[PDB]
Amino acid sequence: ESDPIAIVSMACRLPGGVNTPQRLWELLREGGETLSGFPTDRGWDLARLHHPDPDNPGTSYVDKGGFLDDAAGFDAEFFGVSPREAAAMDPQQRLLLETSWELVENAGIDPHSLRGTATGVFLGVAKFGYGEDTADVEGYSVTGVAPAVASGRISYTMGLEGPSISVDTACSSSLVALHLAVESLRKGESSMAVVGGAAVMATPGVFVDFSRQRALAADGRSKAFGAGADGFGFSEGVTLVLLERLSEARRNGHEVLAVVRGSALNQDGASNGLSAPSGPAQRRVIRQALESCGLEPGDVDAVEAHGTGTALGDPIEANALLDTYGRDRDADRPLWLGSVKSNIGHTQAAAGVTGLLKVVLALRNGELPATLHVEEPTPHVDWSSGGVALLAGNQPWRRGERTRRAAVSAFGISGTNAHVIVEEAPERTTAHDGRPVPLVVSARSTAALRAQAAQIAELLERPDADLAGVGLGLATTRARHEHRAAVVASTREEAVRGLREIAAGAATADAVVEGVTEVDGRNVVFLFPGQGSQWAGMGAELLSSSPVFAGKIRACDESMAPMQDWKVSDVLRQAPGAPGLDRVDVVQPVLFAVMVSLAELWRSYGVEPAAVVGHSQGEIAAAHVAGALTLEDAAKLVVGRSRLMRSLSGEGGMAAVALGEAAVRERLRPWQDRLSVAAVNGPRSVVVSGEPGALRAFSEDCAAEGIRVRDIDVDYASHSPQIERVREELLETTGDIAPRPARVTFHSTVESRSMDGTELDARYWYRNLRETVRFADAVTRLAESGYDAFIEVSPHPVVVQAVEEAVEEADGAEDAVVVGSLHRDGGDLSAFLRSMATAHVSGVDIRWDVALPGAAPFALPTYPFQRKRYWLQ
Amino acid sequence: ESDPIAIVSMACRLPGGVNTPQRLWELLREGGETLSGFPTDRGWDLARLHHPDPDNPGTSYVDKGGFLDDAAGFDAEFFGVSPREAAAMDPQQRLLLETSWELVENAGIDPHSLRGTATGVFLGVAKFGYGEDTADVEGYSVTGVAPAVASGRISYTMGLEGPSISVDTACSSSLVALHLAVESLRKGESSMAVVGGAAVMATPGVFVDFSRQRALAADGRSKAFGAGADGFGFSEGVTLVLLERLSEARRNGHEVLAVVRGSALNQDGASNGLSAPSGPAQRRVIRQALESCGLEPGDVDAVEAHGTGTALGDPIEANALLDTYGRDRDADRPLWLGSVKSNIGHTQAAAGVTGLLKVVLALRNGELPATLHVEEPTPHVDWSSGGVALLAGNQPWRRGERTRRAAVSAFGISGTNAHVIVEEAPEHDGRPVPLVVSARSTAALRAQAAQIAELLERPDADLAGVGLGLATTRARHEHRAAVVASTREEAVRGLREIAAGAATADAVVEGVTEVDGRNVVFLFPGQGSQWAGMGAELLSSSPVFAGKIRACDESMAPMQDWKVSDVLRQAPGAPGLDRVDVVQPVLFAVMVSLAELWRSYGVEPAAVVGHSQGEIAAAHVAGALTLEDAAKLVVGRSRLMRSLSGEGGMAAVALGEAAVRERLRPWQDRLSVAAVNGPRSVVVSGEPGALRAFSEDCAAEGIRVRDIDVDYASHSPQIERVREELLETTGDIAPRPARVTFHSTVESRSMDGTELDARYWYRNLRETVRFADAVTRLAESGYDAFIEVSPHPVVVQAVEEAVEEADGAEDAVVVGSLHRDGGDLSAFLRSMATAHVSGVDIRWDVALPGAAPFALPTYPFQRKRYWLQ
Ligand SMILES: [Cl-]
Ligand SMILES: [Cl-]
Questions:
Q1: Any bridge partners for residue A486, and if so which?
Q2: Which ligand is nearest to the CA of B161?
């Protein structure tokens, strides 16, 4: 067995529009062909290129061949490559960047997740003369055509760290690569491998050279094992497979298309010419392939041959099959023989791995396609004698009792031979609907995002299969790029409706969020506001749709039970008998629970705060979330404090003033029954606190002068001298709370610095209660020191504006996110998912798979490349 | 750790005439350089090519580089290449053909012994634009530049049958190549592997290219880890090593130069820029090397750096070292660091294996050579405190205490990296010496002789060593020559003589053969070849000979008084060669012993043939008769001819048979025609009166009849008179199926051993020896080499004559074995030489017991210019 290697993904660019393994299966299955005239768009002097006489120098006797449809197109911004470098790059490299991205995308892996891993690269490639003719301080022009860079550049671009090797063994290049990668894998030197070949003809060089030799079919058809075998027909290809040991695919959960069971390489040495095949040599590689995995010939159902259609090489190839595979035999199980080159020509370095594509595609589509141009088999072989049988039609090849196996052989003109044995993979709607599902798309440009939304738009309306799978597939399975957009939708018509809006550049729409970011992650600050953000709705829908949130609400009710007789879930529910949100000593606990429970919900989706900050009593919640306070000590505090506030009802009062701290401070000098400056929240937002009669007189006092003062709905003057008289009951009710080390940076709005959780004494909480809360300064200092994403953890965003203000004016922060979490006519799961989208799109990562337990990833289309023509004269 | 891969051999073409590993060592020892002007034989437009401002399109600001001496020169006939295919071959491919040839020869292997073997070939190569505008029904101009054909062509021409892979990883291609080879060896997919790389710049392209980026050292000196590091300095090289697993190299007796302990490959990944080096990546590749072979950093003594002499790459490289090998280190045994490129430049695809060559030569010579251009080490590194110490001067590095280990690192511009750990290897005559030389042309034989004569003057020399190595270590080609010498002075005389292009001393023989193998006939003549002293020096010498002689002496012991041993040494009062009853048994015993000598040396007859009594040694040699039975016969019929003396005579007539018969009718007392030996060679036998008359009628028509020194008349009618006792005396013989074909000259047909009855032996004695038309018949059924196994050659020209009048051989060879005053082993060797030199193969090692093979020079290629214009 030993640890057998899986084919985990595939990708191609082949002649005729075949830019997808699916499109190649459709070609094989309709039994079609992709020959076409020489390309009109590569600069070739087509008038002078053609001449019927082989011996005529400098010309080709064939004007048919297999060519890629737009070999010059390339998305260069996508690959961080400039217009000039692109121009200088061989198409072989450009198509490999595209193909290898497709290939990983195809295997259901976010490409970015291979960054830094021992992923390796093994390629067949050679120069065709793209460099040559027309004469770079960056040396784009040596690096753009070097075969060694074709490997390298895939690694550099994708961040891979395994071996990257380019191999030239001619028309076996890609099977040799496969063989090297298995070993690399077999021995742990590579964890996955990208394996293949590229061949894109820059010049008609190969046509002219081989016309000299009379080596080309006149038709341009590669008639494998047919009576007309005429010569080669050359084609272009860029084909790739992704390999991983079977054990490792399972453990990561990657779908396995097939299994490389074994393979062999050899050389046929002293043949009848450097040029010519060797039948003994072929018999030998075949036999050594079978033995290297423990198989006997009988175990193999089909061979996808080298089959070039060369008058001399087909008989040699077939007889060698007849001498190995054909020896034993049920006269009712012959070895099925065909070749891709009949469909799509000879793709040179991409030849052998293209052999694989067909094989793996036959495996998974349960049948063997026909080979073409075989109305009559070549007369130089005994066919109906011995057991090798051309695939004149397509045959069933279905999962049954008998294991399915088939082999690929490839044999270059330098004489190095490969033969790989492929085996079917071992054998293989888990709940869904109702419920919100986030759809996030991204792309490296505006045009790409619009396209990316539109192809997902059209996927979802294919009623086939649906909502959360596309959701999960989008989240765990595509890279997250700079341009992001997100739809929260619970119904597929809803979703396409909003992807369309995105595709259409028509921006807005309610549950549709768009954004742009250059960080792929940030330093997150959770901000816990004071009272003011409460609504009678608050946590209801959440309690019934979210186990994590009801989790904490339930824990809080548990911690608070000895301190009161009403319970938060009951107030959140508005049950008959619910205390109502009028009395501070109900509000402040309820809010603590809510704020603290949301913080929890955020952490569910992997958002961990690097710091917290809190406004007034909000610091208690902040403090519990950094973990400086157990839930019981937090509750003790929040309840002790507010029960007192409720005793002080009528004794004092508070107001917001549309003015700066200093102006307010000159204004308050005639008083002391009202040295407020309770709170400073921004330049035009300052709270003032003290005896009613000095407040009324001071506030009225600037209705003259037209300075805005709004009164805050509160029955007491906190952060003022009118607080001094509850100090003892407080330090009493609440001493020997036991504060601990903070897991998270706690920046205090009272002390105006980071505070070890150990300093969060009962005396500190008194100070909180007693002193001006320095809210704008806190936020400002945090933005000065690098923090990037400011998230208000409340029922309604009361401090967002204040945050946008403090960030705005602070050195270097025109790249920062401020977000709330719930609003008044919009608390509930999808509202919250909307906040997270809003945070996501400006750079904060969320683990969306939490919103989708049970869901299974839908296979998605690949990146929407935004191509431009690159090509030199 | 257990059975890693031995490097058993080394080969190179580097700049400055550096065409031999030891010349490479000469260079590292003297701390020399190979910088030179741009070559004037490659068709570059030198006048326009060079210009000091980097910005200027089309040009280089550098005018110096490392280049080969004869990049265009190739011996195409040697490799079976047509002068057309050759002009069209990338120099990279031609040099790879030559250096791979040398590599195997450097190993002490006959490169023909690898034909049909699983030897694999793993090379770094890339296209430099050889054909790209000169401007061919054979495909020579396509196959001639294909990177894949540079490996494939090695396998095609040497009959090698393992994987042959071309690999382009840029600057690390060779080390990648190495890694892949080691894997294929470790898993038994190849038995041996040729590994290395090739780089030959056909066009100034790289120079124009890396000028435009100011990447080139102004100077062109690759100042690795130097203060004044300036950029690359490019060079050409072709460099190979021969790998194989320790255990195989021990089985075949291949000398192990060093050991590839451990090895790893990785990638920069997403670093600072596609062609930029990554420190983190260098750290990880080092640590994977160490961890995959069970070593720890402190177990390594030296590092052969990628050391390109770039201002930006060296500190990165050195800090990686300083971060893995130095970190912990003893103050006292720090890591020695140097780079071959200080010496010879960046040789590109070949850079890695060339570093590797450096490392091994350093292993063989017990020292680490100095790195150059380090008067002041770069200050961007911190040599100050700890582990890394630049090889400012040569350092001793000898076998002994700790195992010696060094690493070679290599880092391509494509970001693929390589770190490989190399460890040290584990723990006369007075007599004649045969020296065989061979080559593919006569010019080349003269050169090979020439170069071996030079070898043999070096005080030291060792005749038998050079002999042992010429014989067991080199292909045997078409043109062949041989000297049989007992001293150095005389060997040199002989070779010099072959190299002079004319003339023979007896000790020297030349030949041209198109076979490397013959179908041998052993011929066993009769009375005539006897000479006093015959066996002697050979008894005292050659025990194979003495043993059979002794074996004959037992056999004959119940049958006579005298020892055959005694007759050769001429013992006081020993029988003497004047009477048949001695002469016959002695010749039986000598011929039979000589036949065991030839077989000693691996010459096994495919048929034997006999003249009259020589059919008895024939029949024993073939296995039809035991030694006892054959002795009964030889003694049996010798004894009846002493009792027939003076009764008859015998005489050669120089006339054809038919006409001899036409003259024999009036005397049927000579049903002579005793023997027919050729067209003017017939033997007559009978009553002495009758013979006198016939002779006197002969003389008198001017027909020459001489008389034979014999007193009896075998094959005559007089013999009917003794048939009696012959059968009584000679029955009880048990013929026995023979291993080897017995072509009878009595009956003229291959015979079947078991027909060799007493009654057949009587016919032998009575009927006429049809010797000519026996040999002609053998010659026509495709037998090819005729060895007269006798002590003087008595049928050789009769056999020559018979062979020329037979369709088939323009080309047979006929040699004898000894001569009258050339008995002795060195006479016998020059006899085998003569036969060898025409295609009979000989196990010559047999002549040099206990010798030790001596390193030789490689094939002296006869090169012509090939270049496209
Ligand atoms: Cl066979
Ligand atoms: Cl590290």
A1: A440, A513
A2: 1
